[PDB]
Amino acid sequence: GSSGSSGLKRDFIILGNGPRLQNSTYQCKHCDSKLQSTAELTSHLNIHNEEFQKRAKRQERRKQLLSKQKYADGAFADFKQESGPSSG
Ligand SMILES: [Zn+2]
């Protein structure tokens, strides 16, 4: 109280591709991050749980898109990914 000043305003920055290449990195399936190894994932994940506990509010719209997936039958008893053509 008994004051009158301000100073709260900043910006963010997101950029960094580089020709670098992935190296034994862990591509999380929750935030799409990159960890060194499980040792880090085991902990990193835990974060999600906590973040979900709070984030889990009385939201209104709750839905999730689907991920179509194809497969081959093959006459001869066999099953292989045989990833189809890259639609693009
Ligand atoms: Zn994650």
The answer to whether residues 25 and 34 touch, using CB atoms and an 8 Å cutoff, is yes
* Runs of H (alpha helix) within the chain: 38-55
Q: How far, in Å, is the centroid of ligand 1 from the Cα of 38?
A: 12
This entry's atomic model was obtained through NMR
38 phi and psi, to 5 degrees? Answer: -45, -55
> What is the residue extent of each domain of the chain?
1-88
Neighbours of ion ligand 1 (CB under 5 A): 28, 30-31, 33
The answer to whether residues 32 and 22 touch, using CB atoms and an 8 Å cutoff, is no
CA–CA separation, 27 and 37 (whole Å): 10
Q: How far, in Å, is the centroid of ligand 1 from the Cα of 80?
A: 29
Domain 1-88 superfamily per CATH: Classic Zinc Finger (3.30.160.60)
Q: How far, in Å, is the centroid of ligand 1 from the Cα of 65?
A: 19
- How buried is residue 45: exposed, middle or buried, by Cβ count under 10 Å (0-12/13-18/19+)? middle
The answer to whether residues 30 and 45 touch, using CB atoms and an 8 Å cutoff, is yes
